[PDB]
Amino acid sequence: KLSEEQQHIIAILLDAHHKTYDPTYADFRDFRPPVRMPLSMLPHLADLVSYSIQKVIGFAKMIPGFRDLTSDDQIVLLKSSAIEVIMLRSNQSFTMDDMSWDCGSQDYKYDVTDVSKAGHTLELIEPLIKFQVGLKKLNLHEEEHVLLMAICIVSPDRPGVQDAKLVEAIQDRLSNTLQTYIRCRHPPPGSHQLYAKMIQKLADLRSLNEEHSKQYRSLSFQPENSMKLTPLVLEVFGN
């Protein structure tokens, strides 16, 4: 069975997610508008990403144990995982119907061609789409989804982590909660090797992270592209 501590952890992570992910996408109006006539989708998508960093941080703060870490380690962890959690949380809007991210209206519906209109290439976009499909196929329960995001954030192997023993202990408590949840609450056949398939997604995210960071570096070396970013995006991703 799920212990009462494990039930608590799930309860908090569900709530923390409901409080940082608005499924009506109402705030999207406040973004610089999408242009599909260059890098015409860069202003819109930088604002979307910037907004999403803030939400990921809000989610992170509420992870049981996260607040016992130093502010230094909190920083390393959020800085390296932000892109990954944005990719994960975006699965909620992703749809296999047309391989797009559907945020409630045609204006806020993003496809392969919109992402390339933000200065990215297929070297990132094709594996990102593949990631989104494989993840959607897992048909995760909300409980598994929020647990996966939290485990991704609290990873002990990120470069620059000082107290790695403590980061691993916080994560172990989440990993164990996830494994037990799958065994007690996820009925076969869906549950088939479900944990190991979720952990593999965390591997895939490392590759996507490395490729995004490479193209981000190339995109942002140009001061005219950098001008189109936000201060938070520049602080978190670089330069």
Partner: peptide
């Protein structure tokens, strides 16, 4: 180093 915005958002 120096992440003043990230540090503000964290608390």
């Amino acid at each position: 180093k120096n992440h003043p915005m990230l540090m503000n958002l964290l608390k």
